[PDB]
Subunit: 241 residues, 4 copies
Amino acid sequence: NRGVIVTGGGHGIGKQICLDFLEAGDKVCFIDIDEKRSADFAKERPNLFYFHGDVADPLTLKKFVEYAMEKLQRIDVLVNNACRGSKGILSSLLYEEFDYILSVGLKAPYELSRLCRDELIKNKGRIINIASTRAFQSEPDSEAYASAKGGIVALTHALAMSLGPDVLVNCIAPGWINVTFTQEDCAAIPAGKVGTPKDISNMVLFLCQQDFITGETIIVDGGMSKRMIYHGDWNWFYKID
Amino acid sequence: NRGVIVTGGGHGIGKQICLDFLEAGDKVCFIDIDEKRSADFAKERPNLFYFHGDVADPLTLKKFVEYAMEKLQRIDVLVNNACRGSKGILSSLLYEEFDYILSVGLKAPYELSRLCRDELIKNKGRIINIASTRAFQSEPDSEAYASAKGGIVALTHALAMSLGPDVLVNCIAPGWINVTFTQEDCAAIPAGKVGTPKDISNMVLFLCQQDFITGETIIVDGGMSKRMIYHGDWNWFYKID
Amino acid sequence: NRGVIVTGGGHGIGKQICLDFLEAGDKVCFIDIDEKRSADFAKERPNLFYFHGDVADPLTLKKFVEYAMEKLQRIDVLVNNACRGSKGILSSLLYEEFDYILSVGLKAPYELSRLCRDELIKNKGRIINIASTRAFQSEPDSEAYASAKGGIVALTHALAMSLGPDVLVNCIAPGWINVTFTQEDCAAIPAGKVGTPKDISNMVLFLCQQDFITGETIIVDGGMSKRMIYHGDWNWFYKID
Amino acid sequence: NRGVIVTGGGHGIGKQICLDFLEAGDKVCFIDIDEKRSADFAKERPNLFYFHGDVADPLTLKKFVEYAMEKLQRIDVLVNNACRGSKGILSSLLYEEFDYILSVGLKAPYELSRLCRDELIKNKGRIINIASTRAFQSEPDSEAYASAKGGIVALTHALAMSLGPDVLVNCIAPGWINVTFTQEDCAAIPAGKVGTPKDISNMVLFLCQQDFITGETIIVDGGMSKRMIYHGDWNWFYKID
Ligand SMILES: NC(=O)c1ccc[n+]([C@@H]2O[C@H](COP(=O)([O-])OP(=O)(O)OC[C@H]3O[C@@H](n4cnc5c(N)ncnc54)[C@H](O)[C@@H]3O)[C@@H](O)[C@H]2O)c1
Ligand SMILES: NC(=O)c1ccc[n+]([C@@H]2O[C@H](COP(=O)([O-])OP(=O)(O)OC[C@H]3O[C@@H](n4cnc5c(N)ncnc54)[C@H](O)[C@@H]3O)[C@@H](O)[C@H]2O)c1
Ligand SMILES: NC(=O)c1ccc[n+]([C@@H]2O[C@H](COP(=O)([O-])OP(=O)(O)OC[C@H]3O[C@@H](n4cnc5c(N)ncnc54)[C@H](O)[C@@H]3O)[C@@H](O)[C@H]2O)c1
Ligand SMILES: NC(=O)c1ccc[n+]([C@@H]2O[C@H](COP(=O)([O-])OP(=O)(O)OC[C@H]3O[C@@H](n4cnc5c(N)ncnc54)[C@H](O)[C@@H]3O)[C@@H](O)[C@H]2O)c1
Ligand code: NA
Ligand code: NA
Ligand code: NA
Ligand code: NA
């Protein structure tokens, strides 16, 4: 049926997204840097193809898409999911390392969209970007991650406006998703549980099926970002170390 | 097997929401001010119950919930959908009429949530509020509608933080939904079509089934609000009369 | 040389706003429900006029504007500041009391803007609404306050789009402003202090002097709403009781 | 008094910011790629120092800050203003060119903040980032610009959270600022005029003086982004070419 490409499909959120599309009857090709885990994931699942590589490398991206077109023969959906968090200004994270985070989290989604532009337009496809609530609020020392995620939230509406009406483009901003808890861990989140990869993949598949939502970023974080918190009020306390 | 209550269920978005829950196998009780249309809607649909009334009147809201509990015996989902458009400051909309808009669009959602509080908590239920993209951008002379819609967007995260983790509460902000077009009408929307009630009801039922989204407002407007528009650029033109 | 009207001008933020305009050389007329405090405030300040009344009552609003036009002879600036905190769904806040909060925080700003419409247009004036960060995030049991504040944020862009280019209309959303602290109280706020009325009045007078900002809401909360908080991380802890 | 560094200070917004700080009695060092214009700007203004260079180059950034410390002897304010727009996915903008835009608009602000971190903390300074309303809405073919601007909006709250309470960090998102008009050009903007560099520099200096605003992005666009626009309504028309 559909040809689907996923970045970072070897584990966590990306893995569950791959499974969901497989279950929906589609063929899936994913890129990931973790060779062993990804190869196991693809083993004995004929409709799941793995490409070993780093999305930070533009040359690797083109080879990936070429490989995907060979295995899928069509691209209907691009899921931009790859990313690894890091530190920031308090750690004095170096320029080159800040850059690498942008390469993985921001340049890759653009370049993949660019490589797949004509195919997605022809197939009237979908692009789904995975961001984070870190695009909107910050903990200290999160500069690189925030920059990449802020960037991808904006890239989402840019792509939506460039590629509409043929391609619809949306973004999901997850909160705490368990990809590996005390009663405080769970109670502190308004929805009262820690998120799961399925919470994200459900929204991915749903968004891909709609045709009147584009350019939007949807927050899936159990309500954490909506919780107003002041020290000493409603169960929350700041502790000076 | 859910008991579902919907406001403004006699037509348009509310009507489609009612049908979707019915199709899902739930029982639905809806209130609406348009009696003839609403009675026809309910006729020969045993699991669909109609209550005639104006949600602006608090007494009617209490009687409505009492009726619903009698017909449904349980309330699992509350959908706040009822609202009517209005004018504003340029029409010099009277105080009492501004108030009326607030009664329908803001007070009712709160009062219904309050009346159903214990029932929803007990049943681990859901609340879905229908707002509008008019909460975030305005045309001239829209003060009443904007105030009610802005209010309901905030009421959503307020209710979410009060009732979590037992009840999850979300909001959908529709753009242009045809509840009744030129080539320009459709082309001007990035998604390239005018919206339909099904676009909204799909999101309503999806949100009710999730358990890691709460307090959020999701924009469903074909990308219209994400489109940057300046006169003379990219096909848009301002015309002085 | 401006005629300025302020609601809730007898204390706290409103009071400081009044003083700032007086210092700027303007004449100020303010309404407030606290008579003794407000009379003292006005005493022996010839350019400061006090009108006793509850902004919840539409008749009082009209009489208030009439008084102001008699004392000021012209209205250049309207500052909607009056509001009182409340409870919500967990306290089962009654319908009539929820309504009252809306009367003070949402209906009054609209009605005052409506009463002053022609005067403000003629004078190329300004409207400044005081909201709260509670428009965007919630603590439990805050439904009434959230609804009014969310409403006023939207009312702001509605009024801006109706009255532009003649009248510019903006909103300030304060965080914690001391209108009356532990080491933790101050350290928990990223800016490292509790806010003061002057922090708000500075922005009020600044916004009135600009001519390229309209419809916006500016957050003045020492960065509190931008702080991502998860239990156990970066000095924050959730405590179950 | 204060030591101020500005990127892109040779023309437009950056130039006006430099002038404003000079007028305030501070010493200003600015980097710019346009040598002739920048040298003229600095000519015979003893407190204004020009450094020729491209902010895209990390080595140039370090030399710039070293030069600035030599001329100013202290850094109290960092204004991240440099940026040049480009195209995007419809032009199939190449990876390397997308990257360059990120280097100028996103990497530079981070690296400069990083280089000046200790100095700004010691001096309890300020960082002001210049973004754009393009961070929040898009015209077609704007991917690179959107990505950089979205990134810098998020970088702003990240820096604010990392460096508070010692350094406050804010962002201004300009709309149409004339740095070089028909009656439609002006009437189409709700505030009824095109923006000027002074509209931005006023906000820069104001923000630098506040101490209870941090992590915030302020929109200065004459209300354009708040205007709801649908084809055929309220003077706006989409034309299919
Ligand atoms: N997990 C969370 O709490 C959370 C929160 C917010 C956002 N996110 C976002 O979710 C997405 C997936 O993250 P996750 O939580 O599943 O992380 P994860 O580590 O569990 O999985 C990410 C996958 O991507 C792969 N990967 C990383 N860098 C790569 C590269 N350069 N080239 C190719 N493959 C690479 C990894 O091998 C891994 O399999 C990311 O974009 C992340 O920013 C996650
Ligand atoms: N249609 C759109 O383009 C659009 C856009 C944004 C938001 N919305 C929102 O969608 C919701 C549904 O509106 P719609 O577009 O379907 O309108 P609609 O006219 O098609 O239906 C609204 C229904 O509510 C009923 N109703 C109105 N006022 C009532 C009251 N006071 N008490 C009881 N019933 C009442 C009407 O009789 C009608 O059956 C509203 O909340 C509206 O604000 C719609
Ligand atoms: N103080 C904060 O931390 C904070 C935070 C967010 C928003 N705000 C907003 O700031 C504004 C001012 O509040 P404040 O903090 O200065 O409170 P405050 O108690 O210090 O002063 C409010 C003033 O308004 C008057 N008032 C209240 N209700 C009135 C009514 N119905 N009619 C006429 N006058 C009335 C009171 O007598 C008082 O003088 C309010 O709109 C409030 O919502 C304050
Ligand atoms: N002008 C607008 O309508 C508008 C709208 C939104 C955002 N902005 C933002 O305002 C800021 C300033 O833009 P402007 O409108 O003044 O543009 P401008 O072209 O008038 O001036 C930008 C200055 O930066 C310099 N510059 C560009 N690239 C550089 C580099 N790589 N290294 C060193 N110097 C460099 C240029 O020589 C120029 O003097 C930018 O960040 C831009 O994104 C402007
Ligand atoms: Na396989
Ligand atoms: Na029936
Ligand atoms: Na007096
Ligand atoms: Na000089």
